[PDB]
């Protein structure tokens, strides 16, 4: 039943927002990055992007915009990393799972035909170990604490995002000039509306003709907007806004925190020598490893200390 | 939590107002002097005069349902034993309340 | 029960009378007034498919 | 930017109580985004910090638990007993060895 999962971002497309390191300098990306939650176990992260994922123009594909028109790639093509490369897992809506380490940036890229896309955006990307045995890399064999990662299926829960209206993106490949004068022409199938200042105040919506408009001699005093009535994006930021309630639905999220199960590793043994009233303790941590102990009497006296070098303690 | 950010109000020459909802921590405020950019090309084409309206509130997060805390009170508590009788060759084992 | 609303015809949320594959725009109005609904996800995963 | 500027009353309140300390800050001149800046989440500073649990602090060697919130196996204090004990399990002298 994954029909009934993917249905509701059929009524979404995906959007160009602003990215602040491109390949070059500060653009306008098909691949921004809105969100990264990295708070998850072993490694897991959830980007909310501006494109979409798991939907064709199809199993493993990005989908994204282009200057208006969607276009398509295999998933196989994009790749992230923070630090060291990561990987990505699947994909549904405005929303990717990655596994990656820990870093103080994300940036995803995907290569054309010789156009290189990229959007590095300064989100703090953490590694968050389980148990009391701070790991860097999860472990071969140990034993199974209880854990909180991104779950890897779309499953329907409870917790939403917020739709709405796209707003009036404004173009100018419509408009170009005459010989004389200023031409708009709007795309067919597709509803433009011109703003001029050549005369007094003029505004005019058009429809699927090649309009011409007298009085105006250059193309700089006129902007051609676009309209389209369907297809709803995220209340994003990076996007201006419709004008009246602006509000058309609200979609569920997927890859939410649930309840698992992960290893951790096991500490070496310790070599304990008894002696009259006392204990001690010969402790060889492979990587560093909380002891703490507690008295049982009405002061506890208890102590907590981070080892990460071979120590005795009596 | 997660900040929430409504998307900014663009007005060509004129004057937006800020009309509130009442959100937690709701902040906005209208910003005079803007010249925004899309991906194709500007957007107004009025030079001054132009008005962009921020709007944030704070709304808690997606994964609040696995992971949050509980703030409790506790006071006058209640001891339970799983004692385990033998009264003349005769064994209970029984939840007594003490 | 819940019943949902496109205009003054309270529709069972289960059987809404527009889907998306036909309509680009109307379901998505239908979906724009019925946001609080606590039925919402009934009329959301009815109003996909026919 | 502690722990408690969010409030929700439930899981599932709808109203929650929000300080966070935001602040709107003025876009950046031709970009059309939402600048904000506030105090970082105060669990999440709460929990970088967390002094640690009570099941490894407690005195007299408790073991907490969670789903109802209990204390096990405190050694301290002491339990008396109340037996009403019928007359008829007296055995006499000569129905036992001696």
């Given at each position: 039943?994954?029909?009934?999962?993917?249905?509701?971002?059929?009524?979404?497309?995906?959007?160009?927002?602003?990215?602040?390191?491109?390949?070059?300098?500060?653009?306008?990306?098909?691949?921004?990055?809105?969100?990264?939650?990295?708070?998850?176990?072993?490694?897991?992260?959830?980007?909310?992007?501006?494109?979409?994922?798991?939907?064709?123009?199809?199993?493993?594909?990005?989908?994204?915009?282009?200057?208006?028109?969607?276009?398509?790639?295999?998933?196989?093509?994009?790749?992230?990393?923070?630090?060291?490369?990561?990987?990505?897992?699947?994909?549904?809506?405005?929303?990717?799972?990655?596994?990656?380490?820990?870093?103080?940036?994300?940036?995803?890229?995907?290569?054309?035909?010789?156009?290189?896309?990229?959007?590095?955006?300064?989100?703090?990307?953490?590694?968050?170990?389980?148990?009391?045995?701070?790991?860097?890399?999860?472990?071969?064999?140990?034993?199974?604490?209880?854990?909180?990662?991104?779950?890897?299926?779309?499953?329907?829960?409870?917790?939403?995002?917020?739709?709405?209206?796209?707003?009036?993106?404004?173009?100018?490949?419509?408009?170009?000039?005459?010989?004389?004068?200023?031409?708009?022409?709007?795309?067919?199938?597709?509803?433009?509306?011109?703003?001029?200042?050549?005369?007094?105040?003029?505004?005019?919506?058009?429809?699927?003709?090649?309009?011409?408009?007298?009085?105006?001699?250059?193309?700089?005093?006129?902007?051609?907007?676009?309209?389209?009535?369907?297809?709803?994006?995220?209340?994003?930021?990076?996007?201006?806004?419709?004008?009246?309630?602006?509000?058309?639905?609200?979609?569920?999220?997927?890859?939410?925190?649930?309840?698992?199960?992960?290893?951790?590793?096991?500490?070496?043994?310790?070599?304990?020598?008894?002696?009259?009233?006392?204990?001690?303790?010969?402790?060889?941590?492979?990587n560093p490893t909380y002891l703490i102990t507690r008295q049982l009497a009405d002061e506890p006296h208890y102590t907590h200390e981070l080892i990460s070098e071979p120590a005795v303690r009596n | 939590y997660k900040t929430g950010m409504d998307s900014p109000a663009i007005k060509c020459?004129?004057?937006?107002?800020?009309?509130?909802?009442?959100?937690?921590?709701?902040?906005?405020?209208?910003f005079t002097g803007v010249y925004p950019f899309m991906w194709g090309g500007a957007y107004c084409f009025c030079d001054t005069e132009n008005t962009q309206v921020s709007k944030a509130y704070v709304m808690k997060s997606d994964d609040c349902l696995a992971d949050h805390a509980e703030?409790?009170?506790?006071?006058?508590?209640?001891?339970?034993?799983?004692?385990?009788?033998?009264?003349?060759?005769?064994?209970?084992?029984?939840?007594?309340?003490? | 029960?819940?019943?949902?609303?496109?205009?003054?015809?309270?529709?069972?949320?289960?059987?809404?009378?527009?889907?998306?594959?036909?309509?680009?725009?109307?379901?998505?109005?239908?979906?724009?007034?019925?946001?609080?609904?606590?039925?919402?996800?009934?009329?959301?995963?009815?109003?996909?498919?026919? | 930017?502690?722990?408690?500027?969010?409030?929700?009353?439930?899981?599932?309140?709808?109203?929650?109580?929000?300080?966070?300390?935001?602040?709107?800050?003025?876009?950046?001149?031709?970009?059309?985004?939402?600048?904000?800046?506030?105090?970082?989440?105060?669990?999440?500073?709460?929990?970088?910090?967390?002094?640690?649990?009570?099941?490894?602090?407690?005195?007299?060697?408790?073991?907490?638990?969670?789903?109802?919130?209990?204390?096990?196996?405190?050694?301290?204090?002491?339990?008396?007993?109340?037996?009403?004990?019928?007359?008829?399990?007296?055995?006499?002298?000569?129905?036992?060895?001696?």
């Amino acid at each position: 039943s994954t029909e009934e999962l993917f249905n509701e971002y059929k009524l979404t497309r995906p959007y160009m927002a602003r990215c602040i390191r491109c390949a070059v300098g500060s653009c306008h990306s098909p691949i921004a990055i809105e969100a990264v939650k990295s708070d998850g176990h072993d490694g897991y992260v959830r980007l909310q992007t501006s494109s979409q994922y798991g939907l064709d123009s199809k199993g493993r594909t990005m989908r994204y915009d282009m200057h208006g028109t969607i276009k398509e790639i295999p998933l196989h093509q994009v790749s992230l990393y923070t630090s060291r490369p990561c990987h990505i897992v699947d994909g549904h809506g405005y929303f990717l799972l990655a596994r990656c380490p820990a870093g103080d940036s994300i940036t995803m890229e995907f290569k054309k035909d010789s156009v290189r896309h990229s959007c590095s955006v300064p989100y703090e990307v953490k590694f968050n170990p389980v148990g009391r045995e701070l790991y860097t890399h999860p472990p071969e064999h140990g034993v199974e604490q209880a854990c909180q990662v991104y779950a890897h299926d779309a499953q329907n829960r409870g917790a939403y995002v917020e739709m709405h209206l796209p707003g009036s993106e404004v173009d100018s490949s419509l408009v170009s000039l005459s010989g004389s004068s200023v031409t708009v022409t709007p795309p067919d199938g597709t509803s433009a509306l011109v703003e001029c200042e050549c005369g007094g105040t003029k505004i005019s919506e058009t429809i699927n003709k090649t309009k011409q408009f007298s009085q105006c001699t250059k193309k700089e005093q006129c902007r051609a907007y676009r309209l389209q009535n369907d297809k709803w994006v995220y209340n994003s930021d990076k996007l201006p806004k419709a004008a009246g309630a602006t509000l058309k639905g609200k979609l569920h999220v997927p890859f939410l925190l649930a309840d698992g199960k992960c290893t951790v590793p096991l500490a070496p043994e310790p070599m304990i020598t008894f002696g009259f009233r006392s204990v001690s303790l010969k402790l060889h941590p492979k990587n560093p490893t909380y002891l703490i102990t507690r008295q049982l009497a009405d002061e506890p006296h208890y102590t907590h200390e981070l080892i990460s070098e071979p120590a005795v303690r009596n | 939590y997660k900040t929430g950010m409504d998307s900014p109000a663009i007005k060509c020459c004129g004057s937006q107002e800020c009309t509130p909802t009442y959100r937690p921590d709701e902040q906005c405020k209208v910003f005079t002097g803007v010249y925004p950019f899309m991906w194709g090309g500007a957007y107004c084409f009025c030079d001054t005069e132009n008005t962009q309206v921020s709007k944030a509130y704070v709304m808690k997060s997606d994964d609040c349902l696995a992971d949050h805390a509980e703030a409790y009170k506790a006071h006058t508590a209640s001891v339970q034993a799983f004692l385990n009788i033998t009264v003349g060759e005769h064994s209970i084992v029984t939840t007594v309340y003490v | 029960t819940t019943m949902c609303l496109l205009a003054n015809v309270t529709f069972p949320c289960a059987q809404p009378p527009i889907c998306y594959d036909r309509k680009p725009a109307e379901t998505l109005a239908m979906l724009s007034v019925n946001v609080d609904n606590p039925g919402y996800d009934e009329l959301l995963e009815a109003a996909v498919k026919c | 930017g502690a722990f408690g500027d969010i409030q929700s009353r439930t899981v599932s309140s709808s109203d929650l109580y929000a300080n966070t300390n935001l602040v709107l800050q003025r876009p950046k001149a031709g970009a059309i985004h939402v600048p904000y800046t506030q105090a970082p989440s105060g669990f999440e500073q709460w929990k970088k910090d967390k002094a640690p649990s009570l099941k490894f602090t407690a005195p007299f060697g408790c073991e907490i638990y969670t789903n109802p919130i209990r204390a096990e196996n405190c050694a301290v204090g002491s339990i008396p007993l109340a037996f009403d004990i019928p007359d008829a399990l007296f055995t006499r002298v000569s129905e036992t060895p001696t």
